[PDB]
Amino acid sequence: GYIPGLKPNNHYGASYGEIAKNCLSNPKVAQNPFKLASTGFNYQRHDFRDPSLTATTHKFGAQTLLKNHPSIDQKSNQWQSQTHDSFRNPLHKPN
Amino acid sequence: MEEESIYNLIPKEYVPPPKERRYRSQYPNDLPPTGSTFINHTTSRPGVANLAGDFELSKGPHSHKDFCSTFGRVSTSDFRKKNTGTMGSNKLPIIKPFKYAD
Amino acid sequence: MNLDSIFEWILKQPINYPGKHQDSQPRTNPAYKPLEAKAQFHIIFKATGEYIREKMLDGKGVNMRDFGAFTFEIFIRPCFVPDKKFRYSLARYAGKEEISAPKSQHSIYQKGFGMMFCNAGPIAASCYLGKDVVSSAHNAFIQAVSDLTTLGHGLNIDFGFVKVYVQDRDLRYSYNQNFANTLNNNFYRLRKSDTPTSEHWNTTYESKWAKSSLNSLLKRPNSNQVRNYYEKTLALKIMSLDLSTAEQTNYSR
Amino acid sequence: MREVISIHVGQGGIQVGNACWELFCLEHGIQPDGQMPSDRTGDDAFNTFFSETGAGKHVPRAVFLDLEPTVIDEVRTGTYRQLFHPEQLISGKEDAANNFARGHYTIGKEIVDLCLDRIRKLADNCTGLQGFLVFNSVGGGTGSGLGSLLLERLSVDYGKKSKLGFTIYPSPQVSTAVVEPYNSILSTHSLLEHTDVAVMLDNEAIYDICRRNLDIERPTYTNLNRLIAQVISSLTASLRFDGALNVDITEFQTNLVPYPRIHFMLSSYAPIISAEKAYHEQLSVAEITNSAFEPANMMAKCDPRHGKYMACSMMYRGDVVPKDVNASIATIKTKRTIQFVDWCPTGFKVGINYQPPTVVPGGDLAKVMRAVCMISNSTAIAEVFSRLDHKFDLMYAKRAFVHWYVGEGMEEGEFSEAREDLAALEKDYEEVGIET
Amino acid sequence: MREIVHIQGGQCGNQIGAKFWEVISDEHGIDPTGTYHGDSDLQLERINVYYNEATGGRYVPRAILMDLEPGTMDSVRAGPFGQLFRPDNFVFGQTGAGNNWAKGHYTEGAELIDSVLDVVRKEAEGCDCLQGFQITHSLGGGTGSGMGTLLISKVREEYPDRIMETFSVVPSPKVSDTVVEPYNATLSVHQLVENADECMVIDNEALYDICFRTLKLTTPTYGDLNHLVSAAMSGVTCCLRFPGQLNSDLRKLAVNLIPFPRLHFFMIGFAPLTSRGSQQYRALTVPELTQQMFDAKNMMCAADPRHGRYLTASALFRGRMSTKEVDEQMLNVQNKNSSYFVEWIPNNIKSSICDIPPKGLKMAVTFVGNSTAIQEMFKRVAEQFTAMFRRKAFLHWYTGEGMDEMEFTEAESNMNDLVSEYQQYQDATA
């Protein structure tokens, strides 16, 4: 049943347990930056507007897309895949 | 091995036994369990059933079975005449020789 | 393709057009024997052709779900405008507008005057068939777009009073002159207040259906005679296995 | 070097195996993580149930089956996550929905092969395999169907290996489903010729025991599962603890099964006493065996007073002495309310174990130094068969709920032959019970 | 895993679906922005049953909103939780049906239903394991009772193996706002009894009576009725969405509630409903829940359950409770009412337990019962149908759009035969 992060942003090649641990230990998936409640009053508190607009007509009408896209992090696969030792020790687990 | 002959013609039919008996059961269908205290609500039974292993389990004043106990309900000429009530008709039944001794 | 090759085209591959039309179906009335797949498929289209004009003889026009629309224009002249899915199959057919309608009237039923549906009810009753098999048969034949998408394959689909030709991709049609003059004689048909508003409950449907053009396409057989023959044949069916046994000799006579 | 493989199928089997394995882990000292209890501190007694993995932890010799992902996923989430092998908790994708035909012909076929893979993967490891234990809920679709398929396949795959069944038939009058007689009789047919020993575990009797003894007016499934786990532990402790008189798993069929057809039997336990009044009585072996033979303490809803006794197997764990057991047995034999069949002069097989019963935190029982678990074969068991037969005949007369089973690939004549099999099973018991 | 999709159509269907999705979002902790804020872990484990996951971490109901008039959906979009519904699933016409079954089933339904079939196919194929479909609509409306039934027929013939559920609003003869209710209601029932696997009827007048008598509030509104219907709807799938002592899905209910294929009409109810000035005096215990469950006034339909005999019933208990008291009460209430329970089936009540009570509550029960007392409403609808059909009233509207009186005769014949064979088992004796 529904480990959250796997489906929307597809995870790369790794063990299922490892990716599940990474996407559960990650931040978000909680906390209200917007402070709404499921009961249904903060909806009329809030405005429901997306701040990614500009203008149009008489020149160009496509408009830039939403922030659902990475940035700066454009960086090749061999970089993530192949590093020598700068990782967590797979079998450290202090006793 | 096998041997060829005229008499092997018209092979014999299959004759299994006709039918086994349908059943035979000597226990009554409704056997009240011995210690079944699932049944003592609104009854003068101190949290135990008959516990005597009786097939019948005779019931006295209270019992546990009613047709329309909880949601039952969906004439001027008709009424209650002389002794239809429980406490009317101050009369008594007839006598029997009795046994006692057993 | 003279409306008969289409039947052969539909039948010879079952996998491409699966449905109940590919095999024979029992008749609703036991007095009628079943028909083979090609025969029943032709009979249905005969009855539908008869059904179309009878509704069209009135002020109310009829259309198909995805194959054209038998309409008429009032200034009365019919044109049989096609459907959007059938229009997509046509490539070099000019999209010339025939009926003048404004932006308010968008659906093909709205821009029409008396648009109908060609219900499978009367068709099934007339042919003594089920409603589902007629509906499946119509859906099987209405897939003439796949045949039309292929190059060539000229079609002149008649099914009665209309005469429609299909070129490589062009569409052109002709109509019966007598039927055309019939529309332009007595057309009380348009308005509704002519009737005294009393016979809607006085007249039963059977009386209306008895005088209708339907149910007269096929001859009505003797129900008792055909049942007598079938029962007699079924008697010979099961017990004619043996001929040797006599138990009644009659040597001399 | 002696191993028993436990098979858990269905929600009831899973929820009783949970308590059984918690009891085993606590009794052997293994933590829920699967390790020895931390760095605080082996007798090689855990080998009956557990196996050394070669580095640290132990792995139970169990397999869990279900088609409902909910229970298995929640088990995986639970605190026993690190104990079981990840691919030993086999789960399905769609429930059988209380339909025997679904779980016997449609859905269980795609999972029985994988279950067989896992079961032989467990069986080839052990060298002294004693037998198998199977737990299932009869009144359930997937439970009964998958139990039937597993028993049928295991029989042909293994042959002479013994199998023990702890089934739960529906109670006489109180239950939770409306179609349970159907799959009940079908599973009865399936198991009659395929299981070697069947032990009856009706829930109504256990509710009665809890209400009368533990003084709990709000009992749930946990108490019943704990009682069943105690019964299993008492049965098995002879295979892994030293005792004055040992009985092996092969030494139950050879003493409680007079004929191959008749192997249905019911169990009892004593003492079952709440701590508020637990040991304000002496708990001598005499009174605990008297309470065990008391008819009101039957773990199945049956009255042994209505029939003859075939054979009895009772095992004492604690500090019992053989002379006291002999005295108690002599007293029971002299008692007249209990009568044995004529062709069985001696009918008791006794085993003694020196391991006192273990207590689980949050439980209801009390820390005894003496206990007894008794399993008896008697002709009185036919009453539950009769009352179950009467229930089925009512619905089957009007073709009630039959289209649900026919539409799932089952032939029409299955019901008739199942009824005939129940009739023959009843045929056996009354014929053997009469005096010659 | 075993997720269901939601299909809603018509004004009443959209109104029901809005409140149902509001309740679902509240109980799974979904804000109107679609951000999960559940207080536990297992409010998210089974959230995929109704909520699809998209990029950006937001959740979305897999629901299809549809109608011939955009008037209802533009209003529901501007309401609370209106951003959850997705305009890509919104399919609309421009004419409407005008409370006509012919228009909503033949002319506008057929030409427009291809797109909604496409979107339903897309959603079903996207789903991994489809448990089934559920649909909410009304039988007194033109577009609803026609187009929903046609869509039901299409999706049924496309997925015969999948289960089907509907929440139908049967018109009532006392408070009737439409003069053509018998026609379209009978026409829709004819196809519904043939196609739907499970049907649960809802009566507005019964809702009025319940709201005015039990809750004792002075000003009822459609919001409260929608809330009650939504709570009853979620009570069925509580066991499917959460762990419990006895899990039970929609497939298990059908096997335990359908003796014969044609008898698939149920009446529902919810407990506990108490006036806000009295629950300080009431005690929330299993016996109270069972008695309010079996009270006739609590039923969601105008049919009196004590006018017939219960063929079978199902009870869905919510909250951490033992199987002890539930099954005790079931056995006691069955033994004490042998007159109202048919005798050739023993123990005709099914009980299931789940550990999630509604937010702010400790215990709750949803009741689904199959009783022979539903035939009364069918008889009263039929009597109006024949009386208003004998004079051929308002049939010109229907016969001007493809239908004839043979369809009406076939529909009324099937309904009467259904009533006859439905009351046949009431008098049956072992």
Ligand SMILES: Nc1nc2c(ncn2[C@@H]2O[C@H](COP(=O)(O)OP(=O)(O)OP(=O)(O)O)[C@@H](O)[C@H]2O)c(=O)[nH]1
């Ligand atoms: N004694 C006992 N019986 C249980 C328990 N849980 C379930 N049961 C029995 O199981 C029967 C119903 O079957 P379920 O446990 O719901 O599940 P199943 O047997 O696998 O069959 P399905 O419902 O199709 O999955 C009930 O009649 C109970 O008697 C339990 O914890 N203890």
Ligand SMILES: Nc1nc2c(ncn2[C@@H]2O[C@H](COP(=O)(O)OP(=O)(O)O)[C@@H](O)[C@H]2O)c(=O)[nH]1
């Ligand atoms: N419970 C409930 N019933 C409603 C609501 N709105 C309308 N109805 C019922 O639906 C019936 C009218 O249906 P209608 O709007 O014509 O359906 P449509 O043609 O599909 O849009 C009325 O008799 C009402 O009782 C609502 O918000 N809640």
Ligand SMILES: [Mg+2]
């Ligand atoms: Mg189950």
